[PDB]
Amino acid sequence: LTTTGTEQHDLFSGTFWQNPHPAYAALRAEDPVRKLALPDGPVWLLTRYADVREAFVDPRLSKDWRHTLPEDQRADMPATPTPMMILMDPPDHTRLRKLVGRSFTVRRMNELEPRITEIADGLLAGLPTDGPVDLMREYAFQIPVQVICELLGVPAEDRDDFSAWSSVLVDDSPADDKNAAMGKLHGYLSDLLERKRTEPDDALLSSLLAVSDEDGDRLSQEELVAMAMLLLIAGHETTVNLIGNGVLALLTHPDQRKLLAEDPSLISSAVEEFLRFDSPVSQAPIRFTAEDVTYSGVTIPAGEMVMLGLAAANRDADWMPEPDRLDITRDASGGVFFGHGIHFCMGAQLARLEGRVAIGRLFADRPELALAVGLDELVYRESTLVRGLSRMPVTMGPR
Numbered sequence: 001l002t003t004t005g006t007e008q009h010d011l012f013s014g015t016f017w018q019n020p021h022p023a024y025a026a027l028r029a030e031d032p033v034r035k036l037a038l039p040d041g042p043v044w045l046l047t048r049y050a051d052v053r054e055a056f057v058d059p060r061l062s063k064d065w066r067h068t069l070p071e072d073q074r075a076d077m078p079a080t081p082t083p084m085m086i087l088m089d090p091p092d093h094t095r096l097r098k099l100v101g102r103s104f105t106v107r108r109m110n111e112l113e114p115r116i117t118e119i120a121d122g123l124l125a126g127l128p129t130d131g132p133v134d135l136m137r138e139y140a141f142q143i144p145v146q147v148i149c150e151l152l153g154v155p156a157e158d159r160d161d162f163s164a165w166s167s168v169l170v171d172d173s174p175a176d177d178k179n180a181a182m183g184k185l186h187g188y189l190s191d192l193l194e195r196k197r198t199e200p201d202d203a204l205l206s207s208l209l210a211v212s213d214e215d216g217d218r219l220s221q222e223e224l225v226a227m228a229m230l231l232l233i234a235g236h237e238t239t240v241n242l243i244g245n246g247v248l249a250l251l252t253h254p255d256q257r258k259l260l261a262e263d264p265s266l267i268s269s270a271v272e273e274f275l276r277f278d279s280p281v282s283q284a285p286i287r288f289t290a291e292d293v294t295y296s297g298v299t300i301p302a303g304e305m306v307m308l309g310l311a312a313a314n315r316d317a318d319w320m321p322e323p324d325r326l327d328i329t330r331d332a333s334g335g336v337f338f339g340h341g342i343h344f345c346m347g348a349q350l351a352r353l354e355g356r357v358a359i360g361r362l363f364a365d366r367p368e369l370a371l372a373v374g375l376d377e378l379v380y381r382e383s384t385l386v387r388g389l390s391r392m393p394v395t396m397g398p399r
């Protein structure tokens, strides 16, 4: 629907998709705990930073879908549709992350910088010198999935096929295409595991197979494929939009772009602001209420679905002073863009690394980069959990 009073802004419909921020601010001020009638049913939205951050660590906001279901029917059901950690609660979540963390290390993420810088340069060389091009499809879409390929150790021949299948999930609409692309990804990854079981290498897939703890416990076929699938889902579309929204932020702010060109080393700090200013994960994945929770005088009953407004919260003036202004020189301190608590983005370090390499190399390579269309001529994807551009037409300019 829409907001109410003073002046009303569209929600998850119409004008919302071009700029959801005026709508986000109205909610924060007038209506911060709101049951929203969506296509996929009724979900609650928390928009105030303080509530969002609290909700993240509150155990009463569970990742278990069974909390919607009555008492006597929960014994029947699995805790998860697939054994992914983002859908799991403690202590099951604790064991899974502990075991994957033995392979998906901050070191391994950081070790990819040379391989990341290669992928970026390869696409930059493949972009035209003269004339307009689509920066989303021809650059922004391509970096993350190829980083994910290097991570998992997907064969070089099949990398372009892998890239295409994942892009169908990122893409706007068709559902059957999204359901079948999942199918041949899940097929390819499961197939790949067994090939790495007899021919191992230095890549993450082969690394995850051999993982043990103190007790001698490991990962089975189910969990390994589910982790592979999650790494791709949670790390492709999300990273694409950090690159996308971040480049947009610079092109639509001539002052800040001057600051970065005159001082390239600001890029690490710049990424941090792009994540706060225009958060690619607009709302966090669904949480379910185990018991009744109260926020801003509104009680969400037990069994309801809750989304945490990350993009909204990151512009709360109670947290951040002058929060609508883009300042790359800022100090992040507690941006809920990577989440907060037990579920905090497990690939967050890879995400920042890809963020600085993609955005930093591009503006170095193409200093006279410009938008090819007006800001109101830009089209965003109409998806709940994402803020992101379907296309970004840019002129590369001379030199």
Ligand code: HEM
Residues within 6 Å of the ligand: 085, 086, 097, 230, 231, 232, 234, 235, 236, 238, 239, 242, 280, 281, 284, 285, 286, 336, 337, 338, 339, 340, 342, 343, 344, 345, 346, 347, 348, 350, 351, 352
């Ligand atoms: C800048 C881009 C990214 C953003 C904004 C982002 C955001 C998030 C957020 C908000 C969560 C928590 C979801 C929740 O609490 O419901 C999350 C979880 C996760 N992200 Fe990311 N992410 C990004 C990139 C990546 C990358 C590159 C990877 C690695 C391939 C990754 C892997 C994960 C995983 C595995 C989780 C689940 C952690 C857990 O629950 O134990 N993400 N991400």
